[PDB]
Design a protein around this ligand. Structure first.
Ligand SMILES: [Zn+2]
Lengths: 49, 50, 151, 77, 130, 101
RNA sequence: UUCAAAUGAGAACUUUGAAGACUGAAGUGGGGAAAGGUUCCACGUCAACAGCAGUUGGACGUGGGUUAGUCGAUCCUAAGA
RNA sequence: AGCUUAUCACCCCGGAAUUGGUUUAUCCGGAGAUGGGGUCUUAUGGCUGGAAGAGGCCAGCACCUUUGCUGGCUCCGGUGC
RNA sequence: GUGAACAGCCUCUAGUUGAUAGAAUAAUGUAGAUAAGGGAAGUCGGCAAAAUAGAUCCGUAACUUCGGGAUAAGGAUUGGCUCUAAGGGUCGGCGAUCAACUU
């Protein structure tokens, strides 16, 4: 790598913008079922192909 | 005293590893040279002023 | 505290490795305040970070042993562990010798000490052997010229 | 980058109408091995190239400075 | 350790310089060992036997290269003086002094130059035949 | 010829150093073509009290002078406080280290 | 592997210094291709993980960071599609 | 970037056995050698410009700085299966 | 640096000092090492281990597709120090001068 294609880089950018925990103002909501991000990703645990 | 000097320098040197620091850059206390030059037989009335 | 970044930056600034650079343990807060190469340079010049001159590799022993080798020591069969060829090729020796013999004959012919025909036969005799060195070639030349003028 | 020998062409370059800047450099040099003397380098900045003239004698050098045009900016040292 | 153990075994024991002294002393002893009839078992078939270094070589040229060596000179420089018998060992401790001194002056007078002349005859004999 | 010029004002004023002993060391320990005792018309060591001076027609160098001076300082136990430095070419001087209170 | 100090509630394991050793230029170095994809760097920072530990971390939380007329792709054709 | 610089190769004169020139390695010459003079490629090196103003090594001086500024030196060589 | 050597051993630059620790030192093990005299009596079987080993010189059988076998085999040596001889280049109508490690 380091000579990526823009397709791969765009997917990587989406993955970076997704790689976050869940905001705290969602815990405080009426009828909130969500308590964590179950689609969270890490470079070492799971590979995204 | 020659043997004592050799024994002191043996601990002090450790030259095969790490290249003893230069004295240009280091800084020493005053009181140390007082003791040293008093032991050598000089007096520090010209240095105390300073 | 943790002066890892500071040691790294001081190495990169001074142009040496981290194994050299030195941080006085007394000015710990002053070093930890630094997060920039300009600050590290200030600490370099004021005397808080220094350079730790080189660990030596002396050659007195090597030069002495080489001098004894020049004087002709440490060369016997107990020190030889490779073949005479691996130590010195006969091809190299023959090249030196034959270049020498060619050069000498060229100089003699150009000076006029010898004619081109005797040069021509000596060239091929020295291409073969029977001329072991400069001395033998000169002696053969003298014998040839002497019998020639004798004739 | 280019050297010049003649003086007429250096004056032409100074009057080439695409030159804005020049600079004079002074160096202390030793002749052969022997004596200190003052070399002068008059550089003029063309658009494509940097032309330079090497003058060993300071007397001719300062007369060159005088004969330079006045609008040309110069930089000393 | 292994070097001393496997060189200096009593199986591989050599011939005790006292006896080499007593052998190089007299004419008949040295001529006998120079003659040394053909033995099928000995290395050089008898001949080519160095007496200082009590050793059978194969050939005359192997004798030459042995003599032109420091292993020979070690032994000849060891065999010049007296041979260190128990007489010396006990005279040092104060026991049979007069026997030791008689032996010493005997070697100094009689037996010394006898053996030296025998060695010189041996050397020029070997150098002439070889 | 070649001249070399050492200054000794700093230590001598504070009373740790005597230039006469330093010159007495130099004039004997300087070597020419081998060992001591060959300074015949070649070398001249002379002091003033504040400045020592060497003039040499023979092989002599500032590194050799520094070597000798450091040897003298180690003899008198001054190596760990004083350094021989060059202020100008062939113009040297002794100077204390950066001892501060 | 060791000694002192600093930090900290707490230090066999973190930081600095002082020592002792190791890789020994066909490296335990300095750079790259494929692959990975932010793991790089900084600031906070210990619930879980690092088969002991942990004030430390490729962990956790938040940000910053990849500048080309000249390096490459891009173009050409190779076996081939 | 400017000037200059080479093995091979080529040109003019001349006409070679008493055959000569020559590579470490034996090939070349009346289809014109050796010899004398000259032409070319300019990889490669040398000098100069770039360029010392940079960088490096030292010496200082402010000490109140989270950028403070000056002075000197930076030279000449040698060698190889 | 040793040395034929990018081998093996030590070191400079650069980097690391990571692999759960502490106290004792029983057997049995794992990885090594030494052993008197005898030397394959061991064992299915000399398995394993030992011994040999580099370089200089001498010398080298049968057989052979004549190319090899062959480092056949079997023997003499190897340190250190002080010396000798030989082995070259550049200039001068044999000398002056310079320099390397090979025997
Ligand atoms: Zn013998």
């Amino acid at each position: 790598a380091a000579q990526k294609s823009f397709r791969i880089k765009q997917k990587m950018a989406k993955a970076k913008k997704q790689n976050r925990p869940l905001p705290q103002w969602i815990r405080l909501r009426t009828n909130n079922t969500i308590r964590y991000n179950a689609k969270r990703r890490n470079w070492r645990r799971t590979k995204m192909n | 005293r020659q043997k004592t000097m050799i024994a002191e320098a043996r601990n002090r040197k450790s030259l095969k590893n790490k290249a003893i620091m230069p004295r240009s850059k280091l800084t020493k206390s005053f009181g140390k040279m007082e003791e040293h030059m008093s032991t050598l037989g000089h007096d520090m009335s010209a240095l105390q002023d300073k | 505290a943790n002066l890892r970044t500071q040691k790294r930056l001081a190495a990169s600034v001074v142009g040496v490795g981290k194994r050299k650079v030195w941080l006085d343990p007394n000015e710990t807060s002053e070093i930890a305040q630094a997060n920039s190469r300009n600050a590290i340079r200030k600490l370099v010049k004021n005397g808080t970070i220094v350079k730790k001159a080189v660990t030596v590799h002396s050659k007195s022993r090597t030069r002495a042993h080489a001098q004894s080798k020049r004087e002709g020591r440490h060369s016997g069969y107990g020190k030889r562990k490779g073949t005479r060829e691996a130590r010195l090729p006969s091809q190299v020796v023959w090249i030196r010798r034959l270049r020498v013999l060619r050069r000498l004959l060229a100089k003699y012919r150009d000076a006029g000490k010898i004619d081109k025909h005797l040069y021509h036969v000596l060239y091929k005799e020295s291409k073969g052997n029977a001329f072991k060195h400069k001395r033998a070639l000169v002696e053969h030349i003298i014998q040839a010229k002497a019998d020639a003028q004798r004739e | 980058a280019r050297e010049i020998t003649d003086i007429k062409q250096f004056l032409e370059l100074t009057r080439r109408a695409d030159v804005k800047t020049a600079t004079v450099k002074i160096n202390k040099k030793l002749n052969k091995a022997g004596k200190p003397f003052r070399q002068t380098k008059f550089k003029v900045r063309g658009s494509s190239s940097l032309y330079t003239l090497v003058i060993n004698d300071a007397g001719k050098a300062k007369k060159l400075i005088q004969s330079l045009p006045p609008t040309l900016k110069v930089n000393r040292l | 350790g292994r070097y001393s153990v496997k060189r200096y075994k009593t199986k591989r024991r050599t011939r005790d310089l006292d006896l080499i002294y007593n052998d190089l002393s007299t004419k008949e002893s040295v001529q006998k060992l120079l003659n040394q009839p053909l033995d099928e078992t000995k290395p050089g078939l008898g001949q080519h036997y160095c007496i200082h270094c009590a050793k059978y070589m194969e050939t005359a040229i192997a004798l030459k290269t042995h003599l032109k060596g420091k292993v020979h000179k070690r032994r000849v420089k060891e065999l010049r003086g007296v041979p260190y018998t128990q007489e010396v060992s006990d005279a040092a401790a104060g026991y049979n002094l007069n026997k030791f001194l008689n032996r010493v002056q005997e070697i100094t007078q009689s037996v010394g130059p006898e053996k030296e002349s025998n060695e010189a005859l041996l050397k020029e004999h070997l150098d002439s035949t070889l | 010829a070649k001249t070399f010029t050492v200054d000794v004002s700093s230590p001598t004023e504070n009373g740790v150093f005597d230039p006469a002993s330093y010159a007495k060391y130099l004039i004997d320990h300087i070597k020419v073509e081998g060992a001591v005792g060959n300074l015949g018309n070649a070398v001249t060591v002379t002091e003033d009290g504040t400045v020592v001076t060497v003039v040499s027609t023979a092989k002599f160098s500032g590194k050799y002078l520094k070597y000798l001076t450091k040897k003298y300082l180690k003899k008198n136990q001054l190596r760990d406080w004083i350094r021989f430095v060059s202020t100008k070419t062939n113009e040297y001087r002794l100077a204390f280290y950066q001892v501060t209170p």
